């Protein structure tokens, strides 16, 4: 069960009455968690493998070290004795997380959830066997011959993914997929849209854990990287209810406190569970504009894990979290590498009404690195989507030793 | 004149391409400017007279010292060479601000504005002689003899105010000696107004590189003993009064000049509007914009964008460039009734269960009686519902310090 209880009080950061969170992973999602913590006077310690990471800049103190090293993490935890340990990435020493928890430290949402989400087979079997939710048809392959059999049985086109990816359209792609050993082979779902349901487990006034559901977030990606997201996804009411049902079955199995990014595919009224991250997810950055102040996915996660309540509205057996206005995001990604990134095109980009940008503060860029986002809002979610894309495309980037790129 | 120009580029904090702001005063208003700066990858250095002030906690670096000491401030400015020096309070060495500007550092909105606004006579004369806007009738007194004649000439009840940094509500001649005790004084006629409003006019560059002024909806509020207690947007005033508020604010900010947001204070009675005073920087009543304006557009973000030379989108209406509100909202302060270190707040299960509201706790390490430690924020389609809700949420919170018992409000 959950180690903490419903919270009625907060002290003040930098004094002996402070509450304290420890962010393991200091990227842009951790930065927004740190800003909400600062806005509540909660002390923030940010940890990552490099210095001046986004969340470290906003945090009260930081630690830099190899987050796969259990002894480094224990040293930080023993020094800081945080009220919540918030892992922001899967590349963290898993044994360490279980040991913190066994020793009484609150690991968010629990250590087991991160461990499960770490392994594709473990995760898929949990969804099928424990949560009992619908997923793409699939089979596993341990050898090249098994891969041929799987793709043929599943049917082309199919997706192959290492359990820890390739899109095989025909047998000619089998050799490539095998080179990308265990692999999961999945049937291709020709969905209308992919959605992330940001279900949050948190205490109600009785001290029991309730699950609250924001509107589904639609998104699209260039395989591996989300490129744009928006809220609400334009899906039917039946699909929406089914999205909540499936998310609830999954978060009931994972347990603990915190927000989850439950990923699903939607086609008409049909919904398939794809996977789930037991923490805030990048597509949810849209909630920085679509949810009211103090209620983005980062503030919801923070409130949940400190044991604070979160208001919601019960609708047909589901406790929903009302959206403020439709919104959308579009990533600003580096096409070059190097130190001291710079961004231009702001006169045009920042003159667009109902939109703005957030630049993450990363000190170095690498090709494909997300450096910021454009955010836009409108009564019409499609107008917000086009607008965020437009603003992001007006921005060009350069580093110390590179030329400008669009 | 403004020494920077329209900005099309931003670098990254902590690296050599960084832009950098220097906050002189690190209270709750500076903390929110620091948060928007961090959100844009802008480097923040926060200064104040005590350590771990609200903005210092969010800033990249901080300096602690007597901000009335010109040498201290120069040492910081020479070390940091910021793109903008942002005074958050009036109690800053004024000669220092003029010297920074003379040496090519950008003081917001300009040094003269802070020097004018901190002196009731320089300010009032600026409003009457240069901006040419309506104000309460007034007279100045430098002696008790002049004070008696002034109060008699203005008529009772009248307001007496010390020219710098001690006011009194004179109901009759018998109060005159008490007022002299609180030396220059301004004596004003009493204005019977319906509500006081803060117009958050912001001067900034437009896409063409010229300076324009944009107007958010007026913010209503109520001042209890020199301290605001609650504010809300939009103020419930007539459309005629609203346009007069914009007209008066424009005349005032065109005279003060520079770049940045201004908190122009006015009294409203029906369609009639009187200019009261003006703060040349973000103002506490404007915290309502943390909820009533869209993300990245509270008064703090409007100020930051303006002083970095970035554009701010607006909507032209009847000759005025307006800034659209997202949803009506209100705030109510959370003030300490006791003093001491390590404040703590309780009542959160009930207070944070109220829908469409939340709280911001400033992080101040010590409380003193009357110190503002946080605010409740609430929004609703109906501004009166938001006003009542912010008040209810604030009243659900009790506070204590390391060496005090729990106290309501
Ligand atoms: N079975 C599938 N059918 C259709 N599209 C899929 C399928 N599996 C993955 N994808 C697509 O590949 C990307 C998601 O990959 P996924 O395995 O869910 O995440 P990761 O690869 O980041 O673990 C998205 O474009 C998703 O739509
Ligand atoms: N001339 C006036 N008529 C009526 N009320 C006034 C007048 N001047 C001040 N007040 C009241 O006193 C409050 C404080 O005003 P003022 O002294 O000018 O600002 P500060 O509180 O910054 O000195 C005003 O907000 C208003 O409530």
């Amino acid at each position: 069960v959950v180690m903490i209880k419903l919270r009625d009080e907060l002290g003040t950061a930098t004094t002996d009455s402070a509450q304290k969170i420890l962010l393991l992973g200091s990227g842009e999602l951790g930065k927004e968690i740190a800003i909400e913590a600062q806005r509540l006077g909660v002390e923030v310690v940010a940890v990552d493998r490099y210095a001046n990471a986004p969340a470290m800049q906003v945090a009260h103190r930081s630690y830099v070290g190899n987050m796969m090293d259990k002894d480094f993490l224990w040293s930080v935890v023993e020094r800081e004795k945080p009220d919540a340990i918030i892992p922001e990435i899967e590349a963290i020493n898993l044994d360490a997380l279980f040991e913190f928890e066994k020793d009484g430290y609150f690991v968010v949402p629990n250590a087991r959830a991160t461990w499960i989400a770490m392994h594709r087979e473990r995760l898929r079997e949990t969804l099928v066997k424990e949560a009992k939710v619908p997923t793409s048809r699939y089979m596993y392959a341990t050898t090249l011959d098994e891969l041929y059999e799987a793709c043929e049985k599943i049917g082309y086109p199919c997706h192959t993914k290492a359990i820890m990816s390739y899109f095989v359209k025909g047998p000619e792609d089998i050799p490539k997929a095998w080179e990308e050993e265990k692999i999961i082979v999945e049937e291709h779902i020709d969905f209308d849209v992919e959605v992330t349901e940001l279900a949050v487990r948190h205490f109600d006034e009785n001290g029991e854990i309730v699950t609250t559901f924001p509107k589904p977030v639609g998104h699209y990606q260039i395989d591996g990287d989300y490129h744009a997201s928006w809220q609400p996804a334009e899906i039917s009411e039946k699909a929406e209810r089914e999205v909540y049902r499936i998310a609830k079955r999954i978060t009931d199995v994972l347990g603990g406190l915190g927000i989850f990014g439950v990923e699903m595919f939607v086609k008409g009224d049909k919904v398939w569970a794809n996977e789930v991250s037991p923490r805030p997810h990048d597509t949810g950055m849209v909630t920085l504009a679509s949810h009211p102040p103090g209620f983005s996915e980062f503030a919801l996660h923070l409130r949940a894990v400190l044991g604070l309540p979160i208001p919601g509205e019960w609708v047909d057996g589901y406790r929903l979290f009302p959206m403020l206005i439709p919104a959308a995001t579009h990533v600003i990604k580096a096409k070059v590498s190097g130190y001291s990134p710079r961004f231009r095109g702001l006169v045009k980009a920042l003159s667009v009404p109902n939109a703005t940008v957030r630049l993450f503060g990363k000190p170095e860029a690498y090709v494909g690195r997300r450096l910021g986002i454009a955010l836009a809002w409108d009564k019409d979610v499609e107008v917000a989507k086009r607008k965020a894309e437009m603003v992001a495309h007006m921005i060009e980037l350069r580093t110390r030793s590179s030329d400008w790129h669009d």
Side-chain angles (χ1 to χ4, degrees), chain A residues 385-396:
Chain A
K385 286 165 69 184
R386 284 178 224 109
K387 185 168 280 191
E389 174 175 56
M390 180 175 99
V391 168
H393 286 165
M394 287 171 124
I395 296 178
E396 291 185 347

Side-chain angles (χ1 to χ4, degrees), chain A residues 134 236 238-239 242 246 265-272:
Chain A
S236 64
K238 181 173 180 194
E242 180 69 355
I246 288 167
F265 301 139
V266 180
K267 192 181 179 183
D269 301 325
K270 180 74 170 184
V271 186
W272 297 256

Side-chain angles (χ1 to χ4, degrees), chain A residues 346-359:
Chain A
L346 304 179
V347 176
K348 286 182 182 178
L350 300 185
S351 286
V352 176
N354 305 336
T356 190
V357 302
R358 309 254 161 269
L359 300 173

Side-chain angles (χ1 to χ4, degrees), chain A residues 84-155:
Chain A
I85 296 173
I86 304 174
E88 299 284 59
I89 56 171
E90 281 289 309
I92 282 168
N93 188 290
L94 303 178
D95 279 347
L97 300 180
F98 283 107
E99 295 182 10
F100 302 152
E101 188 180 74
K102 176 180 185 181
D103 193 41
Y105 290 101
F106 181 38
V107 174
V108 170
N110 47 57
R112 169 92 167 194
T114 289
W115 176 77
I116 290 181
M118 177 73 58
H119 193 282
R120 287 190 199 283
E121 172 164 357
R122 222 141 52 195
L123 176 49
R124 178 52 54 101
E125 295 308 306
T126 298
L127 296 195
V128 175
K129 307 299 190 189
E130 308 173 72
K132 301 176 193 177
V133 293
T135 69
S136 58
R137 288 163 43 244
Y138 67 97
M139 10 187 336
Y140 303 101
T142 319
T143 76
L144 179 56
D145 187 35
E146 272 171 345
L147 183 57
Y148 273 96
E149 196 58 68
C151 298
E152 268 133 48
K153 192 169 178 182
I154 293 301

Side-chain angles (χ1 to χ4, degrees), chain A residues 234-283:
Chain A
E234 299 191 280
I235 61 177
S236 64
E237 307 195 327
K238 181 173 180 194
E240 177 187 355
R241 249 140 22 197
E242 180 69 355
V243 161
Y244 299 153
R245 194 186 69 76
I246 288 167
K248 180 79 195 329
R249 289 191 148 283
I250 289 171
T251 57
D252 277 356
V253 168
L254 295 176
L257 300 169
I259 203 152
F260 294 73
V262 185
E263 295 298 328
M264 296 172 252
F265 301 139
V266 180
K267 192 181 179 183
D269 301 325
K270 180 74 170 184
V271 186
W272 297 256
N274 169 33
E275 53 183 1
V276 53
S277 61
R279 53 180 56 88
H281 193 57
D282 54 15
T283 57

